[PDB]
Design a protein around this ligand. Structure first.
Ligand code: CO
Ligand code: CO
Ligand code: CO
Lengths: 208, 208, 208
């Protein structure tokens, strides 16, 4: 088995010309991670073993600076353009004035075995916990998805957290999530994780 | 690290002679997927990065035509024959008149990070959602397991769906699951997913 | 993509000198598994495709004899020493009189897609079920975490089980978990799994 783990996407009815990932020179992509297609990876990002970032259906997939995509995390997205050239707007997320299938902001941690599936956006300085799930949702900035929480079809307001195990599928429930406060157990977590993963990215780059 | 990702299973007390996978020429197995042992993969199937199909304990594992095994999905199964040559019938699923450890039907989608663990059967045209789980169960045809749902020890009747996050462990609960209807949010999903993944399989085969 | 899947950890502010894994000659590490850093793997252990054992943040990570780390399982841990040389004792687990970030005991099964994230300890002869999660917890010996259960911030007493889907986050709830008894469905499971995986480790070693 001989292959390149950083690859162009395939030609399909919705993808006339292949794109290959645009990765900042200071990002570290593990040899056992997979990054395919129309992807932009920012500076000082670490992509760990067994992650799969695949921008071949819905595109583009963006990962902002100093973010981390941990072991086994999957990024993928629903088709953004149909077989007619029509952009399927329900499957497209808008962040600032740019369109994405999946937008991962800056300083965001996607912890081990989580998944963010487009259409989706994750705001700056948010922690997506281990085994958590985000799909058809916009997670605000400075949020915390504790381990095994999920956001499906909702907008999670800035500065809120989703308790471990909780699956949020209605906007009514998302609106009443609890707020991150100083004494909250995950209140400083993301900053510490980002500091660690920026340092891991540089250490691993020095072995590459 | 030099290896073949499509491999025979190992000799064990329950597996006197190794078998290697039987894969249709039109299926695409990603270089970073793993397919081991007594496996049959049908036409136009796509197996994505980080999937692991391992037919070394319970066997055989079958994946029908135009189905997809998405990133990080695991197929494995409990031992089907003991150290005595006796077939452990509780761990064997019957589909038509053929015996399998895991049977994935035709046009079935196993979405990212899901797992189907034998004994198990998944009927045609069913969607197994992201991070969902099927074990010791028979999922009927035209079903939908929404993201993070699970079927354990049960038979899910044809045309029903399991709401996101719901873990179904009793036949009484499986019998009362809701039915897929036209206005249900996942009612056309599988057909669209299968169309996309058949096209991805061909596009990726043209890069191989 | 050319790489070694068994690697030293990177130099960081908390890791002045790299360590490479210490793996018993009778253990089998799949070519598509990843094992990085200050890790000790015992005899007759099987590490399956797509597992990631990464001892680069919190360390060391230990896996005892005749245990198994199944497909897609992730072991990782919170930082154990800060940028000051101070050992962060809350993130360190004590087992006997030795300190670990993650301690997996002997005869323990980490089933497919589970994760044990340090600080954490898992006692001998315990089964951690498919897609289950252990973090900031001490799981006793002879326990069973059924599929999709989770232990977060708690001590699970010896001989207890966590029902499928249940997320246990309080010591009050952990104290009242049910006990494994002869008639419990998973009462003999781990011993059978360990017997199978010890045999798989040897079979796979004979293909290596
Ligand atoms: Co997808
Ligand atoms: Co198994
Ligand atoms: Co971690």
């Amino acid at each position: 088995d001989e292959f390149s783990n950083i690859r162009e996407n395939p030609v399909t009815p919705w993808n006339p010309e292949p794109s290959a990932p645009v990765i900042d020179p200071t990002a570290y992509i593990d040899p056992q991670a997979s990054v395919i297609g129309e992807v932009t990876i920012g500076a000082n990002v670490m992509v760990s073993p067994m992650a799969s970032i695949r921008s071949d259906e819905g595109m583009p997939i963006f990962v902002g600076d100093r973010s981390n995509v941990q072991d086994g995390v999957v990024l993928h997205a629903l088709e953004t353009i149909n077989e007619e050239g029509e952009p399927i707007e329900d499957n497209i997320v808008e962040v600032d004035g740019k369109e994405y299938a999946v937008y991962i902001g800056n300083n965001v941690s996607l912890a081990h075995q989580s998944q963010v599936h487009g259409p989706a956006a994750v705001g700056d300085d948010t922690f997506i916990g281990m085994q958590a799930f985000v799909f058809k949702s916009k997670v605000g900035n400075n949020c915390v998805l504790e381990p095994r929480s999920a956001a499906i079809g909702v907008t999670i307001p800035d500065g809120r957290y989703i308790p471990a195990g909780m699956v949020v599928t209605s906007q009514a429930e998302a609106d009443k999530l609890p707020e991150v406060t100083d004494d909250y157990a995950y209140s400083h977590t993301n900053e510490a994780v980002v500091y660690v993963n920026v340092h891991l990215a540089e250490g691993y780059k020095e072995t590459s």
